[model samples]
Target: PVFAVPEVLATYHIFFQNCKIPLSCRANRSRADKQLALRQGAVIPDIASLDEVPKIFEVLVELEGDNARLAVLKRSIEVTHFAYPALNLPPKVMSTVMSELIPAVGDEQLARWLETREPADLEERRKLMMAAVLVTVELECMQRFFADPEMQRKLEETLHYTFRQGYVRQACKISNVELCNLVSYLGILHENRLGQNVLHSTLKGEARRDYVRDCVYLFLCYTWQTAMGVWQQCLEERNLKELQKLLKQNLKDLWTAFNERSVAAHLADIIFPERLLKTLQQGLPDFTSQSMLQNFRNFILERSGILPATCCALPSDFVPIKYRECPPPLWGHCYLLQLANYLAYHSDIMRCNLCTPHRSLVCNSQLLSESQIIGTFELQGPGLKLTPGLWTSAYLRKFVPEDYHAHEIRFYEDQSRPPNAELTACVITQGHILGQLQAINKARQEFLLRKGRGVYLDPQSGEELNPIP
Candidate 1:
């Protein structure tokens, strides 16, 4: 104390007289090396360096007491959230340091634990910690899963068993680094449809729920690509029979997933069906009609009864919808897995084309007036590019649905082949094409209806009234 009369040894006097502490590293060693002389990890700070101390660690240490240990786990998940990025702690030590932090050690403990030997923080710390451990298991496990099919198969073997423990929950309060990292790990598990791995997990319960809740349409192309890649390897290795059976069961799996309240209506919306689309551009790191599955796509069309030449015939009892100011929607996505499944057994689908840099011949050739030209985009193939207006029709006609002209349907690069039922642009589906037609037709009708309603507003008012632009 500044005015103390007592003979108590002040902290400074004790340090000067008897304490043997060093301020910074000495001799030839660097400062970090002094970590060996004492300790460097999460050390209590000296009063002198109070300004250098992080307030978060102080609060964190308080949660480390025996009674509050569970609270620490909860704190880690909560504090390390995205909403408060400044406080994020590394998930770096999760698989190791956090492994046993949750109560359960196995399925039985897990079942009992799920019923609640739990933290009651409303955020449900035990549930979150268990999820953390499960995801960590997925991460450490998948580090080799993508490269090792043996490991992948091994993961698949115990997949349902782990899920039976029921740690996965679809609804989460913490959508932080942990959740995103789990998504990263799940991508490694991805085998077929968006969450083939997760679906495998789900079919067993528990990210099964998370995957069930995922935005599947956004990741749809990727799952298709993964399936094609795995399918190709199997075809080459003489696993055709098993894989064909795989197709049927897996198709049923998607059939079941499609029926879930969370997924059904969204997956059914024939065109850009989702209530929202996540990314406008970005598709499978590589996709074109000519991707690895091209062989698969073309093979199915010629052989599968699924394609049926045309869906144009519709159901025998089909009814034309009222096209009032709008058309309700298109019922489609037929012959998708159906055609490919049959094609896999028959022949190879790798046909090629003359691909070069895409340079538009005449920008806005259909637009009128000299200065009305809109710039054109230069597309590449992976070259993934297409020559607008099919220059070669004979190759395309075989795949285009009958009654739909080759020019009308527009062949695109399939996964393993050059042209099949693939998107004309980056990863768009059949419905996107129909959407374009509808959009353009709408624009035409709109223009016709507003012919006398066109009005011109004074320009540049917002841009320079205050000259901000």
Candidate 2:
């Protein structure tokens, strides 16, 4: 039972720390109590300090009933320093602490566990090992290996082999749910380290296809889940878009194969209600005719609970989607629509008002105070509609806060006015006032152009009216 000492210490540490908090703070108090009770049942060593390495090792060996105890010991050592804040520990000490612990759970011990486990148990061990490896990486020890391209590639390849060893596949032989989870964790690891680079390198080519496909599949699954409900973590719009692109690029064939196999139908039966199926069937008109994309989208939406409203807009810094690429039309449309909807819904009132006159007119309340509109400029032809403008130069100037710089004065003549009457004019005559007006107007025009307008305004209003619109 000495092998159980580490587990006991870990349990005791958790209890000793968490018990001081109020019962309300310990949401899982009952569970912790049970764990503490179990730890008390085990034999533990009486050790005083870190200097007793020999005693600690001896206790670890005695407590380990089998290879499983090695995993427990490793986990205990890994978490031992968790109570300490990173800022409080010196980097050298932190590194030394990890170096001392990691060798206890090295490849030999991990492989040994892999060998001893039944095929039924191999996946659990594999996952445990993978989780340990990830912990190692997270602690920064694995970073040195990642810095070398050759080493990184080898590690990824080895990871793929472990995933493919039939154990993972057999464990989820019926559903592949766990396999999907494993793939997703791997994808997150790659995403954090490689970002976009993984798409071109790690996820590219035929041999690497399954790895990329499963990763994308898992990511999309997670994304859709977040979209559907209260997700604590959300994907950035750009990252989601990048993922969509990767899926389209690498999984087109897998998508096809899955479709042919009616995988979506199977998944739908498992995860979605009939209403979701009907909605997806009706909402995605083109995909309905083609089973693959339809099924993929449907399954993703169901598992992830990601509704159309939940998808995010592409980040402002995102590279523009190349229309010429002939990416899957249905997927592209869905992605764009989600982004557009999010932008439209969350568009800041001040920013929107600053961008478009029409938007300004609609969202004016956000930009100007009620007192700012001096009087109405009536358009006789348009059913006597009142056009409001800022009344006095002084009042208008106040609204134009110090952050703005006035650039020019301009007059707008109503060309539609009858020839006999003095041309109906709205002239922003004050140089300072006009400059502020033009700047806002220009900013609005540019926004419209970016939103897919051919020409934002009438060209005849002096070519100066156009600013990249």
Candidate 3:
């Protein structure tokens, strides 16, 4: 009475549809449900219950021709019984489903079928199905070998030919995503040295070989850019000596790497003009220093095969041979012309300071008058003092105009600001002047002390201090 034929077939139809398994038997739900419920409840049935279950197994065995499917069925029956506590099925139902379903479909085709299933909100269900199928196939293969020891030994020899092929196929698909992630991190760190992005540390060390290579190239570019910043800052301040020192110390390795043919060829492709412009703006000496100029020119020539030539033609009265071959005289003249043009265009910031706001300083006016102007100008005679500030120290005054002069420049060492002597009317012509003044002031203080003239006193009361001479 429990084995209703219609219930048995109906259960098979629904189960096959849900599991994505094709069914070859006729629907008989009445018999299937009644038989399954009786078996699940542990009821000792008569001949009818046992007979109906055998019929379902016969249909499954006929649909699944291979012994492999039969093994999966046997295992699935045991697993299903233990897995479902509330809705238990007859042992024959699990066996029928496993035997008919697993062997009928290929793994790739099964994957596609799961993907195209209805109830579009079933992505998790799809992945679960795929995972289950893979696990089932693996279990079936293992069980088949264990069932027959002789076949298992032969299967072991063929494993290299079978298992290895599938492994290699799967690896090819997975590794590309991993490689791209690593490459992206390397690029980000290369551009931003101080980057604190979380992903920078998250990428593990076991990355692919090509990814590692990209990381190395990125790090090299970072080092090169840092060295460039240091070099440019020194140049912009006109600290030629410091610039030279940096090139020798910090940039030596980068320069060496850049020169080698192997490295130069690759970097040449990525080094854009915009990057070079940024370096130049930072005060890298692109034109002033001969060595720096030559190095840059050579690098450009290497890339484009065009070198800039200097035009040394000067005015007839401008002491021709005295500065004939020197590039600075010609370069400085050109630079002065450009500076004059810039001053002419933006007169607000570039206007000359005629004198201290209210002071009647003749030399200051003369110096301003001699200043190169691209617009309306006047030519005053040589009797005017075109330069001001210090005139006694020839080296300090060399850059100043000879015709225009001011009171002899004086340096005073205030005990409070000992090493830094104040220059009352100073005009900075070169960068080294500040360092030189500091050194000179230190020496002057030591000289004054040695002569027993070093005195410590209170400015407000004219009282001699305790540590006085």
Candidates in order, TM-scores: namely 0.15, 0.14, 0.12
All models, RMSD in angstroms: 31.6, 29.2, 40.8
Candidate 1 residue-wise lDDT, 1-469, digit = tens? 4787734532211110111111110111122112322211222111111112212120122222222212233233222111100111122322223442333243443434345454353234334334333332222221222223332222221221122211111111111111111222223432222222222332322112212111221122233334333323333223334433543444323222211221222222321212211221122122211112222332332232324333211111011111111111110111111111111111111001111101111211211111121112234565232232222221112222321111111222222333323313212225554455556656877776765454554485533232211
Global lDDT of each model?
A: 0.24, 0.27, 0.26
lDDT of 3 by residue, 360-432 (tens): 1232332222221112222476523323222212212222222111211111111122322211333334436
**Candidate with more favorable, higher lDDT: 1 or 3:** 3
lDDT of 1: 0.24
lDDT of 2 by residue, 52-151 (tens): 1112110112222222312233233211111110111122323433443443444454445445545545444444333332222222221221223333
lDDT of 2 at 138: 26
